[PDB]
Amino acid sequence: PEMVRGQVFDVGPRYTNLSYIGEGAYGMVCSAYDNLNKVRVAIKKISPFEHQTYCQRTLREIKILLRFRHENIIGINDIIRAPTIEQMKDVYIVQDLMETDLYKLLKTQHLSNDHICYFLYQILRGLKYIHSANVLHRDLKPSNLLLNTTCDLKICDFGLARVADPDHDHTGFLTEYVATRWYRAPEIMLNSKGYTKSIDIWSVGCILAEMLSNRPIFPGKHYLDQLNHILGILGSPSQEDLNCIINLKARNYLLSLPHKNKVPWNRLFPNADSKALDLLDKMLTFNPHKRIEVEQALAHPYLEQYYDPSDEPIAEAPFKLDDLPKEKLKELIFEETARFQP
Ligand SMILES: N=[N+]=NC[C@H]1O[C@@H](n2c(SCC(=O)NCCS)nc3c(N)ncnc32)[C@H](O)[C@@H]1O
Numbered sequence: 551p552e553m554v555r556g557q558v559f560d561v562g563p564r565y566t567n568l569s570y571i572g573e574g575a576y577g578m579v580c581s582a583y584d585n586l587n588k589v590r591v592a593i594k595k596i597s598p599f600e601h602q603t604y605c606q607r608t609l610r611e612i613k614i615l616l617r618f619r620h621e622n623i624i625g626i627n628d629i630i631r632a633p634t635i636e637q638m639k640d641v642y643i644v645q646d647l648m649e650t651d652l653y654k655l656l657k658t659q660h661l662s663n664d665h666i667c668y669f670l671y672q673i674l675r676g677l678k679y680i681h682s683a684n685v686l687h688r689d690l691k692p693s694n695l696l697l698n699t700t701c702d703l704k705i706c707d708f709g710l711a712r713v714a715d716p717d718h719d720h721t722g723f724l725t726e727y728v729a730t731r732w733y734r735a736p737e738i739m740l741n742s743k744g745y746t747k748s749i750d751i752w753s754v755g756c757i758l759a760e761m762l763s764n765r766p767i768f769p770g771k772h773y774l775d776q777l778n779h780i781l782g783i784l785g786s787p788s789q790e791d792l793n794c795i796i797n798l799k800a801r802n803y804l805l806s807l808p809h810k811n812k813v814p815w816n817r818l819f820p821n822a823d824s825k826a827l828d829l830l831d832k833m834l835t836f837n838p839h840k841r842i843e844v845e846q847a848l849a850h851p852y853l854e855q856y857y858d859p860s861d862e863p864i865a866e867a868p869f870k871l872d873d874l875p876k877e878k879l880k881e882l883i884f885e886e887t888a889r890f891q892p
Pocket residue numbers: 571572573574577578579580592593594624643644645646647648649650651696706707
């Protein structure tokens with residue numbers, strides 16, 4: 551077995567000639583030559599079995615990606631692990647090798663309006679399929695948008711996903727922790743558990759804004775700062791929008807704030823396509839009930855060059871873990887990965 555920076559990759563003999571790509575809290579990513587398909591691939595080594603939460607996220611990722619089949623969602627080509635549960639300490643997920651991701655790309659590259667439009671279309675096309683399966687991604691951000699050398703875009707990392715549950719979405723003030731901070735909708739801090747599809751649309755709007763300027767639009771410095779940045783640009787919510795917040799602690803917090811004017815999108819983004827900014831405004835709408843939904847976004851004039859509902863497929867059947875000990879989760883991961891044995 552070849553090693554990569556102290557990490558053994560028991561991926562042979564099919565996968566050889568490894569190179570380090572990235573690393574995580576219990577995972578490392580490498581590129582490797584697939585000796586069967588005669589192409590280099592990406593492989594992530596996961597070692598989740600000592601920690602229940604890691605097992606949860608691993609099972610979610612595997613179960614969702616194995617059930618989804620869509621051009622704008624990363625597929626799992628192969629899963630490598632030991633032949634028995636007793637011997638299984640690591641799991642290796644094999645995917646198509648993607649040149650970069652949108653986070654890395656935006657560090658150094660400005661995007662043409664044509665690339666912004668194409669990327670946004672692909673994000674929303676993939677998200678339509680996700681949402682049609684009654685799944686919420688719940689952590690959309692540039693680093694979870696993979697890109698290959700021809701700028702095909704594929705959504706990845708479903709470890710934080712959930713089945714939508716809008717009837718149980720309401721909660722109290724300053725309790726919830728959904729998505730990555732900069733991409734987190736205002737209602738997460740106010741009264742939402744992040745169980746409705748509108749959480750993902752907000753994140754896409756944040757990504758669109760970031761594509762327009764290469765800077766995060768709402769760069770909160772910590773959890774409590776995030777609402778400051780959102781309200782600093784959107785301005786004070788209307789009476790109607792406040793009336794939709796029945797929770798008194800959340801509503802009274804907003805009422806306690808001084809009046810703030812909206813910052814016009816075209817002053818923040820003076821180079822941007824006006825249709826892009828119209829769509830941005832509809833995705834970054836404060837009230838989640840008024841926020842545009844994924845199929846409306848696909849139909850927006852900004853995306854008219856690409857929009858084709860007959861070529862924007864949905865899932866064949868929707869999905870319809872917190873209490874399970876890590877031993878049961880390991881057994882489920884073993885069972886879910888059996889199809890690749892061997
Ligand atoms: N460490 N870490 N993670 C972040 C780094 O790894 C890169 N990355 C990922 S992360 C999604 C995942 O866990 N996939 C499981 C199979 S690798 N997928 C990639 C892919 N398919 N092709 C090329 N690079 C990929 C990501 O762009 C960053 O460089």
